[PDB]
Design a protein around this ligand. Structure first.
Ligand SMILES: O=C(O)Cc1ccc2c(c1O)C(=O)c1c(O)cccc1C2
Lengths: 112, 112
């Protein structure tokens, strides 16, 4: 969704530490390769965007959710979220567990 | 911009460690201030979305740019950006220097 859409009530920023750009590429390919097709229809799921850090050390996911409850009930309480975590943790090149930060949009600056 | 808009060639995720929920509002208020409107007309700027960590300890800015040059020079060479940095660094309640992670969007999972 647009980054400043009011429907976005909850965001998770997840950082995955990797051993270099080849693993960055593989990790994004894995994340968008069909393992999480099921998440697209989850009520409250708005988006998951995966980025490669320019220094080659991490893959960052910026995920928008309609609310914390929707995230908790429709993602965290679904066992398929554990399946997803296992999938992404299986990749060679992943150097530590993913780190998450939870947060709510509070202000924005859009273009003129 | 939409998170998967093809114009977004470069993203910065800037984290500002703060001492509490009160300073989070102060920091967002300052950063989305109104004197900061010149940023809206910077060539290549697409969006700045300021978030408050749910735990009250951080303010996180997800910023969309057309390219790394737009951020670095169009924004970064303008003196107003140095002004803005100093402003943010001088706010009481800051627990340390802002930390930026630079990255490129590589893939997105979205609802149909
Ligand atoms: O200079 C730093 O590293 C700290 C720091 C302070 C203020 C800002 C930034 C920043 O990075 C940004 O990036 C940034 C951006 O990308 C898009 C919009 C506003 C800011 C404001």
């Amino acid at each position: 969704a647009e980054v400043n859409d009011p429907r976005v009530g909850f965001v998770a920023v997840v950082t995955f530490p990797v051993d270099g750009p080849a693993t960055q590429h593989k990790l994004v390919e894995l994340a968008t390769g069909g393992v999480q097709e099921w998440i697209r229809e989850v009520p409250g799921f708005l988006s998951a965007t995966y980025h490669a850090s320019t220094d080659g050390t991490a893959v960052v996911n910026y995920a928008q959710w309609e609310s914390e409850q929707a995230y908790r009930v429709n993602f965290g309480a679904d066992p398929r979220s554990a399946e997803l975590r296992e999938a992404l943790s299986s990749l060679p090149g992943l150097m530590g567990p993913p780190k998450a930060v939870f947060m709510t949009p509070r202000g924005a600056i859009l273009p003129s």
